[PDB]
Amino acid sequence: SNLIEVFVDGQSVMVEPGTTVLQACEKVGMQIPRFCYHERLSVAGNCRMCLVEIEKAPKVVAACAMPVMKGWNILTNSEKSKKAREGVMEFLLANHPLDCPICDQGGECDLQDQSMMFGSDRSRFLEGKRAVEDKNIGPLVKTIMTRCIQCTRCIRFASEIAGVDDLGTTGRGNDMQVGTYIEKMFMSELSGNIIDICPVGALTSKPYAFTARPWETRKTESIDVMDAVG
């Protein structure tokens, strides 16, 4: 019908108009690295981890936000894509705190795993790190904002899914901080979900703190009975 033909590493794919590069990549089983993109949230495009090279194009594009075009050949594993990933990971890790042994995210961290799979294995950052003050948003979500990478997933979830506009960014530049700018509890019937969407240990569960590691746990898939939603 209206399907257009693109190429992922030379493999032809038929996609609907408006499909992004990331979704076209997903169709053939290739997952593009991401930090700010969530498939149930608005497209942000700020983390820049999803940069990929289009054949015969000099500038890499943000796969999460760029619609595909007819005849495009997406090169997911080229030198340009890998160098972009390494540079973005280096910038992400320059100011990140050395907190993994005391961070509850350790073992199920997207930052850790994508650094292992797409980043470099060492550092050349020879400066001091930034440190930001912590915020209190209630007894449910523990907050350690030095680990924040400014993906704005929590803000987008709060505005779009929960309907609460209490979260935002204050300042600018390297000093931009995610928070409420005042002492205010982010209290919602769906607030705890921002623990799951947060890719790092910036937001964690307070009742769960320090009790377990992800590789220890045994998972049982079952149903909730606290209401009739199931």
């Binding site: 030198e79 890998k82 160098k83 390494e86 980043g119 470099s120 294995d121 060492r122 050349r124």
Partner: protein, 56 residues
Amino acid sequence: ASATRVIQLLRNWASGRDLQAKLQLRYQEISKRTQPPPKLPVGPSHKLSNNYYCTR
């Protein structure tokens, strides 16, 4: 060793070789049990540039 020279001669005649030259027991030629600290060089991937992981 502390053996008297007559016992040394008896040992060397019985074994057929000069035993005092190569003794089983080590006396003072081994290294000191306290050593200076090392320095331990780094390696070939410790450069500051031209060191992208995709090339290695």
